[PDB]
Structure formats: structure tokens, C-alpha cells
Scaffold this active site. Sequence first.
Site, short mmCIF file in Angstrom:
data_model
loop_
_atom_site.label_atom_id
_atom_site.label_comp_id
_atom_site.label_asym_id
_atom_site.label_seq_id
_atom_site.Cartn_x
_atom_site.Cartn_y
_atom_site.Cartn_z
CD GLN A 111 -1.09 -0.17 3.70
OE1 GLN A 111 -1.44 -1.26 4.18
NE2 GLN A 111 -1.51 0.98 4.19
CB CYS A 133 -4.65 -1.10 5.74
SG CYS A 133 -5.47 -0.23 7.10
CG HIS A 182 -2.55 -3.13 9.45
ND1 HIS A 182 -2.47 -2.27 8.38
CD2 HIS A 182 -1.91 -4.27 9.07
CE1 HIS A 182 -1.85 -2.86 7.38
NE2 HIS A 182 -1.49 -4.07 7.77
CG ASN A 215 0.26 -6.87 6.25
OD1 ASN A 215 -0.62 -6.02 6.07
ND2 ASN A 215 1.28 -6.67 7.07
#
Length: 212
Positions: free
Chosen positions: A19, A25, A159, A175
Site C-alpha cells: 500500500q 489498508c 490495521h 498483509n
Amino acid sequence: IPEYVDWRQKGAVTPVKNQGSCGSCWAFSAVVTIEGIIKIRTGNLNEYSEQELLDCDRRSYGCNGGYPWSALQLVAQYGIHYRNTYPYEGVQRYCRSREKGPYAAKTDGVRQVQPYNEGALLYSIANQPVSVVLEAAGKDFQLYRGGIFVGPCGNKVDHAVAAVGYGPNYILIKNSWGTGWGENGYIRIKRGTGNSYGVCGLYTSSFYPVKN
Ligand SMILES: [Cl-]
């Protein structure tokens, strides 16, 4: 439910992204679940636009942060374009969805997993990838490279990521920090402790799309 789940082996997971510095996120989280459900429902694995959500989800805050559930609600009401039709620019811009032609995909709703409930989240992951949240601000999480992660980390979640599988003692998490973080972009988070938040707050806030 199965003993082992990994949606990568079913070809339902796109490559790992980064990102960058933007606070996006929440959009990357949502897209993972969209890519998964469209593959499961239609047979096609395609990359959809995180930038479109950044630009067009009026209930989030662009690069200041946002909500996977509101992104998923927007895709349920309107749809989403391919990532290559609406690429990642790493800053919020005005919503250009109307200039991109008809939508590439569309869901039919959003569902929430009951919080602090490991087994409810496991049940949802067996059906499809799930959007989840965790505390990623600890150095230990940032330096993780592999194995089953037990922390240290607190429960002040910050997150959004995506759970794409699990095993007997772990949940498998994709992730959006690049392939250079973790196990090629992934982390195995320990499950089955005596902590109702889950480790790193993993059971705080989980959602998934539905598609007839
Ligand atoms: Cl263990």
C-alpha cells in the site's frame, strides 16, 4: 470444518501488494475478499481496484484510513472495476467510476462475524477469505519473518488485513506491506490461547461479502 484451509491453493488469491505510505489498508483488505468471492462464485481470478474504493467510499477517509465493511457495502450497491482499469495511485482523488464503463464485478451483501469468537471466524474462513483487523504497531509484528507468531502484541487494533486460511494452531493472514515483509507477505498468527481478543486483537472486527 476442514483441518486445513488455504485459499491460495484453490487459486483464489492474487499476488501480494504494497500500500505504500497511504492509509489505505481498509481498501486492500476489502479487495482481497472481493477477489476471493468472485473466484469462488464465478471461476475467474481477477485483480480489482483499491483506488476506486479509496476515491469513492464516502464513509471512509481516503488516505487517513477507513472501513473494510463500508468498502464492501459500496461494492454490494454499485460494483467495482478491474485494478488495471483503475490503478493504484497512492493518493486519494475524485471518484472516477463513471468514466470507467460498466462494472467488472458486483456482490449482493455484507456479513459480520460475531466478535471475540475464534470458531465463528474459522467457520467463515472455510467458506471464503475474511476481512479482519489487528494491532500492527508493535515492533515484533513489524519484524516477523515466519513461524507461528505468538507476539508480543496488544489488542489496540489499527490495521485491516485478510485471513485467507488456517491450520490447527494458526490463522493465515495476507498483509498489504509487500512481499518483503513476513513470510512472503503473509503471517501465521497463533490461535487457541486463553485470550478473547485473539492475539494482536485478531477477533475484534471481521466481515465478508456475500454473492448469489
Ligand atoms: Cl501452538
